[PDB]
């Protein structure tokens, strides 16, 4: 509901068959048959979950669909599987080192599934009668919990009374108590007992009285990443650092102890390891120290599958003074397999543009689609994809529903691409600030 | 008397109902094509459908890129969020620059929440706490009284705790918010002002209005406000603390888990109809000051599902990108980001619209300029720069006022040109002189 | 009870320590309360009902 | 007055200008620089009008020509309760603040909010205090007899007055002041009782006092930031105040001006050595001058076609051309013999240095051949040499002795260049041996 | 007997009453014009009138610039605040370098204050609290007042303390029979210790035993205190000394330098000017000495240009060995002594000249007499020739190995063989460099 239409919202996964053969147009993915087949092979390895630490480099020219292929892999991966999509610039931080940030990105992409059984008694409290013991030990209580339908009486122990007096629950408060584990919550105050007070308190919350059965059974599946366990065991109250982010370079011995405990919890069967994918978009923006740490960190058994994206040619590696293919050193490319994405022809440009126009609910005419395809082949895919929405707004300002040739031509005239802007800058270089800072603001001499 | 800034005279894009830019309308003159492009952009923003759209305003200095950005801001209205920013502001020494960019991204997505404000104001006449033990009080009966009459309320022990926090006794005008539960003691009434001849009590009058007052308000928050509301390393934002806490809270890298939880809570409140989502504009002037790492994170963050419309400004040409060594790119923006942009070209001016800009700035600053003085100012603007005349307009008015004249004359313009120099004359003085000017 | 000036009838901010007359400000104190003869304070206190002389 | 020894700009009491903004040749401690002083008077009238926001001016010229003297004259002629924030260019390179945040704090320290309020005060001389204690101490009663030169009254005290008078112990004979609403008692001091000493205050106790507060926008930003107490106004650890707090402060200040409860006092932000900022600070200044709540920024620099910090190219005044496009430049020139002589005479008159006419001529010749600051520094050491010989007047021989003992720049350069083997050069080479 | 350092032999500038310099007095040899200029500067500091006066000591290595700065500090006396500093010390990882420079500027300005202290001192006889009637309200404390009885010599009185003062009492662990000392200015309590009126041989906590304090309880005593402006600034920036919880928790936090604002400094200046106007405090301006001023970069020099123009800035003296050198932090700014010409224009350069053979010889003689060594005349002449040939500092620092080799062979005198053996054992920089140039495996 909150999500708007983004650049990759039309992709619902890799458009493959059961034989890992890509369809020409399926699930929002058009073309790139070799790349989609290779990504389908990658997805199966993640789904097998029996091998660890493979580095996959998605390489190609820009606007060819490396990030589109990564989002297709993430959508085909399904839910409750840890997919961590980060950029290469996020590793450089201020209170975390680059290796520690890479370790946190690695351990956020592999988790454990844990099954929980809850016997929840949810209802409004009618009366709490406390049997006051003479010695004070084993304080018996009588809880009158009540739903819309029906109401029982529960016996309450001393720690139950201490938990129900630690948080302030009174008559008319909606609480649910777990029978197996004794978990305590306070959902708030019932709406039936809401008008008795003229002004509500600071922490007073109003919730509806639950209906149906008083006690309900539910099975809850929790997917907890390894980084979550690291942050929890790093501090006394570590759950705040899961959200505020000031974890602060978790020491190694916590990580080895957590790895050994995850192994023994696996061997006794109360949790199961779910591996996932860590996707580093624009991986060329990383230091050589980051690349060396990636090279050593891919060899652990608790390591996810690493998909890296690069649009660089033979470029200078960051942190050094020599050039390298993909902006990556040769020992990183040694422990990697490369998926190459190619450019699109006119039919693939037209199909992707039609899919993006259908996603944004824009009614493109045939001549407007042909003009946008010609502009996409001439300039770029992303220029025509950005031109579609402003042409839609131009046509809507003209009191028209569908777009025509004139709306696309007006959007082409109003908004420039890279080559036209380069030509306009190079024709009048005195009006812009040079690399030496020189400029001519004066219009006459 | 209102002050005048550099962009005070601009009230909007000056377009009609058909989107065609009127030549002189809305504080603008000329620049019709970029104004129409910005009108298409604000129509796209008002559609409230797209995310991550990016437009770059490219043109020379003193051509109106920031003018068009603030014109977009007035065309959208104060309801739509607008985050103006400089590319230099992302370099923080507390948190990393990509986190600052993502925080400014979340600062441009807002929420409207309709809410009620109900207030009980007046002097406490009765304060009777009913205990009904099961030590612990059951409730408290509080009788407030103003000049229009009295009213009795039943309050929970939390509000009784807040009342006894404020040292509220019988005879004190107090303030109670029914929804929040906040209790504020205004002070003792003047009916009890003569119990002693001298005491530390602050004696305030009885409220002239009713005890109970209810009204409707709207809360305009952002997603960054809700992000920093529940991401505190040291909590306690609810308590009123005039003095600072003993440990200074520092800006931290907010994880994506809090962003997803905040998004889930906001979507749940939107699906109930309580809150309304308003996508807005993040404007970055002087985008050439961004590092290549910030450009890479901008490339990653423009593909988010909740990203706002980003408007970038630059005045450079074929320039090396900051943080690189040999990447010659237009406007200082790398070509991978440029592929995601829509470029709006900003044209220079000629003499006539420079003259009308000068006369519009003179009319807004309430200065009377004679016609030949206006022609001299326009000729100086064509010769030196437009902003030189726009900044010499006010010394001309001061030199006219010190000679007891309300009309700027040609001699005032000559005196202001003699007293204050432009960049070219000062550069000539710099070049001719030897000992550091 | 509200305290009032014993001679002008306005707000009595101050009371003179000698004759116990409540006065309004400085001018009334210097022109009336200070040059007040003995035996004139009793009527001013009697109008308020504080005539201590029986 | 406060703490003030004799400094470099102590003699400047403002701009020596007429009612027609015409500079006198010698007035208010400032001589020379007629065009620069008239331009500074125009800028001062721009500040005093208050209707013009965010104007950047550049005071440029050779060293020892009076750019900082002009800024001090503007600051002295501004008056009280108008915020003048003078900072150097190196002050904004902080370890706990970003440079744009430090520039924001410097910008918003120069805009004040003027609020007038009324308070009832009781300032009087205590005649006596009586307090009758109870049997146990549950209730305390007391009478406070206070007086002024005109009035004399007795007060029946409550419990809180008794507790606030026993604390901060007031005896008979003390002139004190009481705020009734806040319950604060300030002991102004002992009265004229022979037995510190302050006279008995004037009459009309319980008086309305009008207090006019000028609070800078940075202080309200620190206050409204709920994670920042006002102790960060003194400790300095404000720590990157968020932008949304500043937007709420701007909207509240605008609605206070609209309601008439407060006024806006624009001020001057002076940046000495503005060339020391780098290019990102220049871009931030270029955008931040457009705010409605922005002060007038005076910038001083002496560099000429220097390399801009953060870049690799050279720009005039060390400033990029987009910043110089947004600014009007005031140019200061050098001084002749007569202006140097008048400045040296003013500096001697300030430091209570009595010197002869030929000594003044010798110091003027030294300040013409060498520098104005070298002669102005030589004045005080020549005076010390004069009082070493038990002479109250500085003669020619005292100036000659001071010139012999203390060197200028050119003599130090020549004496170094004649003996360059004895010093450490760029390569770290030195011959510490004196023989062979 | 006494431990000696490089500048132990110097007692002062050694000038006459007319300011002229005797050739060999005050531990100084030579540098007559430099000593006279330093005496003029010392008289300028003693005038206590000017602000921001800055001189530069310029010369080669081992010429006596730090010697002249120490002589200035010795001639000014211990009351005048002298702040020695290195240009490298301003680079701090906790706070910016300009704040460190301003902190040293405020540290070089001193204040002498007479302070009246209200004191309740005496032996605790009874200590009974009065409990609150509702202890668990959450708004007050468990007690309301505390009655404490104190007796001094010829005097006994009782005090009713509020719970804050009793909290300060009980944090000192005060019991019955303890002589204590309550300072009413801050609420601070000093526990002097156990009274000697009881038995003092049955304790296990190595406590001290004190008599009853003389005079009455509740004295008012006058203390003369010497502080700096930086002490007031750092006390107000990090508040400790009150009994409120902010002061007490700020006692326990880790101390860290902060950028003290101009508002706090102006408020401190206002309070100090009020102290002066009441005639209770006096201002003593002092000296900030910066040796190796070449280590400062261009930002510190730029801030120094502004900071020297202040009306409270001290007298700043600088030292540098550099000649025509580039300024640190710049690229092409060649400047004399590594100091930019904007600061040089605000300076007064005091030149320092190298020494001759006989001056080096008597410097070696004075360093030998201050280190309690006996040197023969021929060995002293050989030490003088070695000092003129290699370096003065090498000849001064070879005296202690000569004394070690002399006391090894059971002699008090230093013979020529001892200084020859010390020349053979220890090498100067030139002979070491000659070994470096004629070696293969990078000696
Ligand atoms: N195979 C594809 N199917 C559908 N859309 C695609 C495909 N490839 C690219 N696109 C579209 O092109 C745009 C840019 O592609 P992108 O994933 O950014 O390529 P790269 O990551 O190589 O720059 C995306 O918004 C995406 O919608
Ligand atoms: N077309 C225009 N009509 C009216 N005023 C304009 C126009 N273009 C620019 N201005 C004015 O010129 C001033 C400087 O322009 P600005 O937008 O700062 O240039 P830049 O695009 O380099 O930021 C602004 O105050 C603006 O009000
Ligand atoms: N016109 C003037 N009138 C009086 N004093 C002046 C004048 N110009 C300069 N001075 C004095 O000369 C000294 C050095 O000038 P300064 O302000 O430092 O110039 P700059 O800042 O350009 O180097 C200052 O102490 C100043 O008081
Ligand atoms: N005039 C002098 N008389 C006596 N000793 C001196 C004299 N000048 C220098 N010295 C000695 O020479 C040594 C070097 O002096 P110092 O000032 O530390 O070096 P620099 O001059 O390089 O700063 C010091 O230990 C000092 O005792």
Curated annotation (Swiss-Prot), chain B:
Disulfide bonds: none annotated. It is found in: Nucleus. One of its GO terms (cellular component) is NuA4 histone acetyltransferase complex. ATP binds at residues 59-66. GO terms for biological process: box C/D snoRNP assembly; chromatin remodeling; DNA repair; protein stabilization; regulation of DNA-templated transcription; regulation of transcription by RNA polymerase II. It catalyses: ATP + H2O = ADP + phosphate + H(+). Its EC number is 3.6.4.12. GO terms for molecular function: 5'-3' DNA helicase activity; ATP binding; ATP hydrolysis activity; DNA helicase activity. Gene3D superfamilies: 1.10.8.60, P-loop containing nucleotide triphosphate hydrolases, RuvB-like helicase, domain II. It is an enzyme of class 3 (hydrolase). Pfam families: TIP49 (PF06068), TIP49_C (PF17856). Keywords: Acetylation, Activator, ATP-binding, Chromatin regulator, DNA damage, DNA repair, Helicase, Hydrolase, Nucleotide-binding, Nucleus, Transcription, Transcription regulation. Belongs to the RuvB family. Probably forms a homohexamer. Interacts with RVB2 and may form heterododecamers with RVB2. Component of the SWR1 chromatin remodeling complex composed of at least ACT1, ARP4, RVB1, RVB2, ARP6, YAF9, VPS71, VPS72, SWC3, SWC4, SWC5, SWC7 and SWR1, and perhaps BDF1. Component of the chromatin-remodeling INO80 complex, at least composed of ARP4, ARP5, ARP8, RVB1, RVB2, TAF14, NHP10, IES1, IES3, IES4, IES6, ACT1, IES2, IES5 and INO80. Component of the R2TP complex composed of at least RVB1, RVB2, TAH1 and PIH1. Interacts with SPT15/TBP and HSP90. Present with 11600 molecules/cell in log phase SD medium. This is RuvB-like protein 1. It comes from Saccharomyces cerevisiae (strain ATCC 204508 / S288c) (Baker's yeast). The lineage of its organism: Eukaryota, Fungi, Dikarya, Ascomycota, Saccharomycotina. The gene is RVB1.
From Swiss-Prot, chain C:
This is Chromatin-remodeling complex subunit IES6. GO terms for biological process: chromatin remodeling; DNA repair; regulation of DNA-templated transcription. Keywords: Nucleus, Transcription, Transcription regulation. One of its GO terms (cellular component) is nucleus. The chain holds residues 112 to 165 of 166 of the full protein. Signal peptide: none annotated. The gene is IES6. Present with 1720 molecules/cell in log phase SD medium. It is found in: Nucleus. Belongs to the IES6 family. Component of the chromatin-remodeling INO80 complex, at least composed of ARP4, ARP5, ARP8, RVB1, RVB2, TAF14, NHP10, IES1, IES3, IES4, IES6, ACT1, IES2, IES5 and INO80. Probably involved in transcription regulation via its interaction with the INO80 complex, a chromatin remodeling complex. Also involved in the regulation of telomere length. Its main location: nucleus.
Swiss-Prot record, chain D:
One of its GO terms (biological process) is DNA repair. One of its GO terms (molecular function) is DNA helicase activity. Its EC number is 3.6.4.12. Its main location: nucleus. SMART domains: AAA. One of its GO terms (cellular component) is chromatin. It catalyses: ATP + H2O = ADP + phosphate + H(+). Keywords: Activator, ATP-binding, Chromatin regulator, DNA damage, DNA repair, Helicase, Hydrolase, Nucleotide-binding, Nucleus, rRNA processing, Transcription, Transcription regulation. InterPro entries: AAA+_ATPase, P-loop_NTPase, RuvB-like, RuvB-like_C, RuvBL1/2_DNA/RNA_bd_dom, TIP49_P-loop. Changing residue 67 to A: Defect in snoRNA accumulation. Growth defect at 37 degrees Celsius. It is found in: Nucleus, Nucleoplasm. ATP binds at residues 61-68. Pfam families: TIP49, TIP49_C. DNA helicase which participates in several chromatin remodeling complexes, including the SWR1 and the INO80 complexes. The SWR1 complex mediates the ATP-dependent exchange of histone H2A for the H2A variant HZT1 leading to transcriptional regulation of selected genes by chromatin remodeling. The INO80 complex remodels chromatin by shifting nucleosomes. Its ability to induce transcription of some phosphate-responsive genes is modulated by inositol polyphosphates. The INO80 complex is involved in DNA repair by associating to 'Ser-129' phosphorylated H2A histones as a response to DNA damage. Probably forms a homohexamer. Interacts with RVB1 and may form heterododecamers with RVB1. Component of the SWR1 chromatin remodeling complex composed of at least ACT1, ARP4, RVB1, RVB2, ARP6, YAF9, VPS71, VPS72, SWC3, SWC4, SWC5, SWC7 and SWR1, and perhaps BDF1. Component of the chromatin-remodeling INO80 complex, at least composed of ARP4, ARP5, ARP8, RVB1, RVB2, TAF14, NHP10, IES1, IES3, IES4, IES6, ACT1, IES2, IES5 and INO80. Also belongs to the R2TP complex composed of at least RVB1, RVB2, TAH1 and PIH1. Interacts with SPT15/TBP. Present with 3030 molecules/cell in log phase SD medium.
